[PDB]
Design an enzyme around this catalytic site. Sequence first.
Site, short mmCIF file in Angstrom:
data_model
loop_
_atom_site.label_atom_id
_atom_site.label_comp_id
_atom_site.label_asym_id
_atom_site.label_seq_id
_atom_site.Cartn_x
_atom_site.Cartn_y
_atom_site.Cartn_z
N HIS A 52 0.83 -1.20 0.00
CA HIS A 52 0.00 0.00 0.00
C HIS A 52 0.87 1.25 0.00
O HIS A 52 1.94 1.29 0.62
CB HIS A 52 -0.94 0.00 1.21
CG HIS A 52 -1.85 -1.19 1.26
ND1 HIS A 52 -2.80 -1.36 2.25
CD2 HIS A 52 -1.96 -2.28 0.46
CE1 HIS A 52 -3.45 -2.49 2.05
NE2 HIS A 52 -2.96 -3.06 0.97
N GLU A 54 1.00 3.81 1.50
CA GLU A 54 1.48 4.28 2.80
C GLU A 54 2.82 3.63 3.15
O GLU A 54 3.77 4.32 3.54
CB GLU A 54 0.44 3.98 3.88
CG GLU A 54 -0.86 4.77 3.75
CD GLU A 54 -1.76 4.25 2.65
OE1 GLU A 54 -1.49 3.15 2.13
OE2 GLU A 54 -2.74 4.94 2.30
N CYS A 83 -6.01 1.93 5.19
CA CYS A 83 -6.68 0.81 5.83
C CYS A 83 -6.21 0.70 7.28
O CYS A 83 -5.55 1.59 7.82
CB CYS A 83 -6.45 -0.48 5.04
SG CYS A 83 -4.90 -1.33 5.36
N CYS A 86 -1.90 -0.56 7.78
CA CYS A 86 -0.92 0.44 7.38
C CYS A 86 -1.07 1.73 8.17
O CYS A 86 -0.10 2.46 8.34
CB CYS A 86 -1.02 0.73 5.88
SG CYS A 86 -1.16 -0.74 4.86
ZN LIG Z 1 -3.25 -0.38 3.98
#
Ligand SMILES: [Zn+2]
EC number: 3.5.4.38
Lengths: 180, 205
Positions: A52, A54, A83, A86
């Site tokens: 992700h 992030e 989410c 993360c």
């Molecule tokens: Zn995430």
Amino acid sequence: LLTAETFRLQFNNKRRLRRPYYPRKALLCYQLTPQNGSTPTRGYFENKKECHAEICFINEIKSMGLDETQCYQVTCYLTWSPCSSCAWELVDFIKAHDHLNLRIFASRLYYHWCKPQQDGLRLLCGSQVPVEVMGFPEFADCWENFVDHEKPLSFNPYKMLEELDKNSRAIKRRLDRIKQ
Amino acid sequence: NMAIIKEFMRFKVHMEGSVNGHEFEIEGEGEGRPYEGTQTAKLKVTKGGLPFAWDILSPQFKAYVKHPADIPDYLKLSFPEGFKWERVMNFEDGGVVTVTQDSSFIYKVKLRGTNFPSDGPVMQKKTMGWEASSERMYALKGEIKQRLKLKDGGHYDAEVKTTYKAKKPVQLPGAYNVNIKLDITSHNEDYTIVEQYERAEGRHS
RNA sequence: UUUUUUUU
RNA sequence: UAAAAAAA
Ligand SMILES: [Zn+2]
């Protein structure tokens, strides 16, 4: 280094979306602002291959070379809200760097509508990072800053103005009721 | 100032013009956010429906410039009285445009364009919109070396000089430069119905 | 990006 | 088969 079309293709997200069905991915836009010598850096991170944006941007900040002396007020305008897991990686990376202060502004409250991603971003807005959804300025900020505002224009001059306003009006009240 | 100048404001504009002897009038309504530096405007030709390029009229639409909180917003403080501005545009092929305007929102514009060559890019409509131009400000005076894009390549240059004078004396700011970008969002084939979008932000020099 | 409800 | 709105 983004496209004017890609801006509304990834940032603009209505309750009932456009004619193609769910052609949407996640983007992140970090704006690191070192106020020491006023030396800002900018960058976008697409949601890459099972990592992700992030975590990708965390590893970018990691392997780019930090300066442990001064403080950085980093803003981050991201399309889809982070989410659960993360977000915890983010807060753990922020607890280890007291010289960092981060603002998180999302476009849409992306989650699996279950319980974990509810408090996964409630700790941010209550402990270290003031997390609110985008409004008019942060879109207008991310519009010309990150997405290239050069010579051409892919027929999206102000169509966002009404869609940005719809997204604000709905999802900002949603996020406020979540934070409360 | 902030109590009377809300974050969302509309305006009405009436322009009477005469270009190379061809007289015309334009009525328009617009809306935008003065503190965020974004505005849109919808125009309608009421007389003479235009034998010239619409792009020469776009740079005439300035009260919607974003100013930092620690920089005195000279143009916003002029309200509710308003202000006036007078502009002279000398094009490289001899074209001359003189504009006067009063802003009280109600805008009253008087425009006179003369000496445009019949085979020039203005009268032949060979223009492709204005390039980005940083106008350095220092009444308030502004000088622009503006460049007009050509269809076949190159640029069509013009020297623009504008004087903005508020009806009420307020504190003048220091040296600064404003980045402005204007876009034509929609227009018909004969440019009789035009919508415009403007972004403007000031920066330290 | 997955559910529930009302209206044209 | 389009579309407006609200709840978790
Ligand atoms: Zn995430």
